[PDB]
Amino acid sequence: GNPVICMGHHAVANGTMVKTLADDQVEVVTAQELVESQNLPELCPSPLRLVDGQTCDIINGALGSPGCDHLNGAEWDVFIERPNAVDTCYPFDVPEYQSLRSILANNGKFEFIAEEFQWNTVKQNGKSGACKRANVNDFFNRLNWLVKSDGNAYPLQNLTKINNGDYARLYIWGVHHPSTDTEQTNLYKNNPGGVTVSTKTSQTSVVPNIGSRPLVRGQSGRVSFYWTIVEPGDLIVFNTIGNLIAPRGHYKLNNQKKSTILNTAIPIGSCVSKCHTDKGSLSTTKPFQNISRIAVGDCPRYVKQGSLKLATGMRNIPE
């Protein structure tokens, strides 16, 4: 009555600490980190379509500022907008800036469809020294600066586009704010000016505001940009007695808008990944990440903790 058989389990020299409900440091044999805390120093151009705006942010890209020609026809899942982007045209603002930028980014493409607007008497294609292309005075190539005729005339404009296509149209137009009354009359005869753009169910009316603004690229005037969306079976009416920065057409809107925009300085590389943060792409299978709340694509969920170890083994009690 002397043989012995012992039942037991494995152990290693040094295991990993994990937390339970009861204990914040239990040593187990193996564990798996669930928080991704490393990123790639680059954005992966695959399998998502990235489009690099480079020196143009997406508003300037949409307006057609100098340097933004490379974004013509561009299609994207994620628009990569650079923080060191620069204004290269006439000084402007957008009253609902973030909303226009959201709509543009979400839509996911720059597909511009030109139209001819039969403007009456006024001179078209007004340019500026603040918006040089090649050198040589120019303007937003999606906009049309209307100024008075050589006979010093600017009559009421009353123009209509009807949408019989199968897609909603995005019209971008602007209103010019002169510095002085003299600047006003020199450009549009009348004083005050005014614009009214309307669809069947909506409208927008703007009174220009004359006054001295800070000098920006040798200009104290400002343009304020607006937009109008024209559904299939709807139509748009342009009404003005001055100061209208007219559109040269419309952007096409996808019925399904599934795209977005990411603001970062990170370079686009050659790797493959479906998850992008403003610090770079993540290449991981972990369920969580602490790298950035700004994340786009098929990503781990963002959390505050730097580490969360899942036990994948029994308690480690060596000897």
Binding site: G1, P3, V4, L21, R301, Y302, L310, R315, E319
Partner: protein, 172 residues
């Protein structure tokens, strides 16, 4: 753990047990040996890989969301935007913290339980031919050569073969 085997009546683990999570260590007249137990090892591995696969599961496929970084304060709407994201992050961080604590608590109980099931399996095979020494070991009250030990490990041990010899050793 709940069963008190691992870090319980099993004093420690075996660093020499390198081809299994659980196993047998014996001593008889021919010598000593350590062998892995496949069934118990596999049962523990399956349950843990099962947690793993349910864990490393789910999408989070998001594109157009909201702004989350701001140069200067704007007021009402920016406050809400920041408060929404901050609320989300706290709730998901709490989920992750609790999840890992629950899973780990459960993982330790599962591995402790599988250790105990192995011990109880062998106790039941041995019937009246052996006594629990209290440290996860059984004293076997009959000669048990290498074939006998192996029959215990692969579950073919027939206790009636040795019962007369073992009873006599235990009680007289």
């Amino acid at each position: 753990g709940l069963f008190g085997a691992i870090a319980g009546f099993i004093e420690n683990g075996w660093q020499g047990l390198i081809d299994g999570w659980y196993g047998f260590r014996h001593q008889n007249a021919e010598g000593t040996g350590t062998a892995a137990d496949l069934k118990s090892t596999q049962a523990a591995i399956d349950q843990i890989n099962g947690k793993l696969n349910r864990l490393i599961e789910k999408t989070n496929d998001k594109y157009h969301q909201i702004e989350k970084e701001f140069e200067q304060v704007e007021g009402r709407i920016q406050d809400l935007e920041k408060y929404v994201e901050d609320t989300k992050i706290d709730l998901w961080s709490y989920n992750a913290e609790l999840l890992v604590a629950l899973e780990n608590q459960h993982t330790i109980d599962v591995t402790d339980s599988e250790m105990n099931k192995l011990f109880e399996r062998v106790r039941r095979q041995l019937r009246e031919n052996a006594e629990d020494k209290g440290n996860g070991c059984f004293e076997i009250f009959h000669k048990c050569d290498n074939n006998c030990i192996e029959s215990i490990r692969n579950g073919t041990y027939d206790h009636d073969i040795y019962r007369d010899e073992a009873i006599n050793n235990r009680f007289q």
